[PDB]
Every structure is written in C-alpha cells, then in structure tokens.
Design a protein around this ligand. Sequence first.
Ligand code: NA
Ligand code: NA
Ligand code: NA
Ligand code: NA
Ligand code: NA
Ligand code: NA
Ligand code: NA
Lengths: 104, 104, 104, 104, 104
Amino acid sequence: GVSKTFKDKCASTTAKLVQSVQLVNISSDVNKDSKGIYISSSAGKTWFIPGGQYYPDNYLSNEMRKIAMAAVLSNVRVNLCASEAYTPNHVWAIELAPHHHHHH
Amino acid sequence: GVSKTFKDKCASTTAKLVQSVQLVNISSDVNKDSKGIYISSSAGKTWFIPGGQYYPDNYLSNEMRKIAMAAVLSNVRVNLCASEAYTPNHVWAIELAPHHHHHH
Amino acid sequence: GVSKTFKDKCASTTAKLVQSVQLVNISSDVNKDSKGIYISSSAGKTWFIPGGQYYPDNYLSNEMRKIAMAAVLSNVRVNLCASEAYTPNHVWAIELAPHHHHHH
Amino acid sequence: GVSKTFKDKCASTTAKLVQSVQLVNISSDVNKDSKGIYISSSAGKTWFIPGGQYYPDNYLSNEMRKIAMAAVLSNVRVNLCASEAYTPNHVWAIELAPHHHHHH
Amino acid sequence: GVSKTFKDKCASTTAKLVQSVQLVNISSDVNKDSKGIYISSSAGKTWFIPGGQYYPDNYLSNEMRKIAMAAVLSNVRVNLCASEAYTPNHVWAIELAPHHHHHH
Ligand code: NA
Ligand code: NA
Ligand code: NA
Ligand code: NA
Ligand code: NA
Ligand code: NA
Ligand code: NA
C-alpha cells in the first residue's frame, strides 16, 4: 500500500500521487533527442524518470531506477509522485509497494 | 536474528536498537525539500536513510540502501540502529536478518 | 508488449524497432579490437550495446546493460531500437517487456 | 566447496582459511566509531569486511560485499580468508561456494 | 549455447574459446600479492578476470564480474575467451549462456 510519509511528501508538491501502479515496461534510450528512462503501466500511461548529475540527485535517481526495474521484473506495485507539466509526466518520487494480505 | 556485534555497536551510541522489523515500503524522492530515502514498517513507522558524499559513508550508505531494498522486495526482516533525535528517525546502521528455523 | 512511447521514440530515429526479442546470450569483451557488450537472440541475431563515458549516456548505457542482463537471466522479452548502420547493429534503446496475460 | 586456488591464495598469507560458512547477517554501519561492513555466521562468529578507496581495492571490496550479501539473501555458503590480527577478524578474501551434489 | 559472434571474436584473438563451463566458485581477494577476481569450474579449472581502471575497461570488466557472479549464483553456463599465456588463464570475454531446450 502507500505510506503516510509518501502521501505527505507528494501533498507538499505540485506533483500528483498515483497509487498501486503495475509497471509492465522499463526502457533506457540514448537516442540524440529522446534520451532517458521511461516506465509504462498496465493501463498504457508512460512516465519519465529524471537523472541526476550531482549529489544527492545522482544516488537518489539511481534508487528510483532500481525500484522501477524491480517492480517490472518482479511484477510488484509502486506509488508515484508525478508532475503533469511534462510529456511524458516526470517522476519526482517512487515507492516500492508490495501488496501484503492482513487476515484479521 | 540479531548479531551480538550489531547489538554491541548500537549500545556504543545514543541510537536505539529496533529488532525484527518487516519493511513493506522503500521510497526515493528528488522533490526540492523532501529529498532522500525513506523506509516504512508493517506497523506504520518510518525511518530516513542518510546518504554519504565522501568515503567511507558513500559506499556504506549504498550498502544500507541495498539491504533495505532487498528486505522489502524479498519480505526479509532487518535490525536497525536509529536516532530518535530526528523526525523521521534516522538509520545509522541496518542488518539483514533472514529468519532461520533451529529445530533442537 | 511494446509501449506506444517506445514506438514513438523509435519512429523519431533512423534506428528500426524490433519487437518481442528473446535474448539468450549477453557478453562483455575486453579484447583489443572487439571491446564492448554484445547480445544475441534465439533466432541468432547479434547487437552491440554502446557504452557512455559522460552524463547522461554513462547511467543510460548502464541501465541498457541491466535490462539486457535481466532479460537473458530471467528469459524475459525486450523491444529494441537498433541502427543497421553498424556491424553488429547498435542498440540505441531497449525496453524490458515481460509478457502479461489479459483474460477479458 | 572450496577451489584449490582459494586455498593456495590463503596459504600464501598469515590469514586463516574458514570453509563452508553459512552467513545469516550482513550489516552496514555509518556510526562515528563503528563504521563498516560486518557479517555473522550461523555459529555466531563475526568478521569485518574492509573497504577500498583506490583502484583496485575499491572494486575488489565492492565484489566482496556483493558475494557476502548474496550469501545471506540466498542462504548460500562462502569460504573466507580472515586475519586473526583483528577482533573482529578482517576478511582479505571471500569465495561464493554454493553446495553442489556429486552422486558418483 | 554459444553465439556465432562470440566464437568469431575469440577466433580473431590469441585467446582460446571454452564452451559450456559451469562456474561453481567466484572469489574477490584484497591480499597484497593475490589481489583480483578468480572463477572456478565444476571440473576444477580456474581463471582470473582482469580489472579496468579507465573507460571502457572499467564498465566492461564490471559486466564480466556481473555475468560470472550470476552464473555461480543461478547455476547457469558461460562461454569464455581465455588467454593461456597466464596461469591462471586470463578471461578476455565472457558470455552468459543459459541452456535452452529446442523441441523441433
Ligand atoms: Na501533490
Ligand atoms: Na503531461
Ligand atoms: Na544504543
Ligand atoms: Na525508426
Ligand atoms: Na548492420
Ligand atoms: Na595462511
Ligand atoms: Na583464438
């Protein structure tokens, strides 16, 4: 599910929260004017994951990519904080969100 | 389980030992004023994992993130050494702690 | 499957889209005259994955290698954007494309 | 099992060979006076894995940590070359040693 | 299996092709005079994987280590291009070679 901390951080930004997304594609592109990391949902929505050249965005963007990659490979849900101001929309946070059953 | 060495190292500091935590969320955030790595337990407690720009904190923080990520993805327990001087609490050490059966 | 965004990006380049490729070999070569990363399909086609020394090609090429590697290890499909202007053909984008069942 | 080359390399040093260790904990610690990577066996023995700032110890220590981490996550045996000049003992080599059956 | 391109590249060098090797040990060593990455087969043969300090050998040697590690951990075959001018033999290329059934 979604952590309260993740919801609170997305509420402090213009980016929109997207809950319980199943990612089915991750791509890396080095073509001259289309460079970057793209992810797509089961519903056919695409996002761009921005990179980072300087501390701390360098390690943080690398962790965003690791999470997106594991979600596609392991078929595990994520929550996103995404800016609609771009095409495709830009991921500014990602949360790995394995679905756990609570039987009580 | 928890290693004696992990308990001894947390006992050498003002940070508190937290044993047998199941992590269910890991997040990476590059939003302007919420940047960082966050983890949440099955109980709804959140910690922040500090980064490292300089040797040795750079590789050590990278190993803390790898441990936290594998714990969420594989549903494996961790032990934490966490400072309560922060909100959220800061992880200063993490131990991967797969539950092993001993039948004797 | 293939994302619309991946097809749109390949349509913006001289590179050709190859859909639903099963990779069965990945290699790393440090021989003087054959240096680089090679991938081969079940059909016996080979591509070269270019490296990157400078941001952003450094992280993007690293993610292309991670995707190709996971595809071979997990026997999971990819989509490629490949330039025929080279021997072997050069990968300029790769998309991890696990086959999902839709029963509706 | 243990490779001949691993035993020969440990025999070339003051460090002691430890065969068929099951690791059950790995930890990364960024506390002021306990910084480092620690690993613990099923028997309750602990070692320290030294870091490396400069080529080649930087990549070699990184591979030592990857091996120890995989061993704990996958419950796979290692062999160690450890210096007893330190408490805890310092790992100067580690070998991933998955147990294979030979029925002949 | 072995890709035609991998055989053709090894045939253009002094190094010898070794097909369908099962690796059962990978080691990382930081001892003064034994430093490096070693891999050993089920047959008891050992190779050394050379490191790389400068682009492109730095990323290519890192991918050779990733391939060898996955082969040991997942019990998956590799093909090697190895120089017999060294003892142990030096790997100049490695190909991940998961065994596929072809029922036709
Ligand atoms: Na918001
Ligand atoms: Na948009
Ligand atoms: Na303490
Ligand atoms: Na095209
Ligand atoms: Na071509
Ligand atoms: Na010795
Ligand atoms: Na040859």
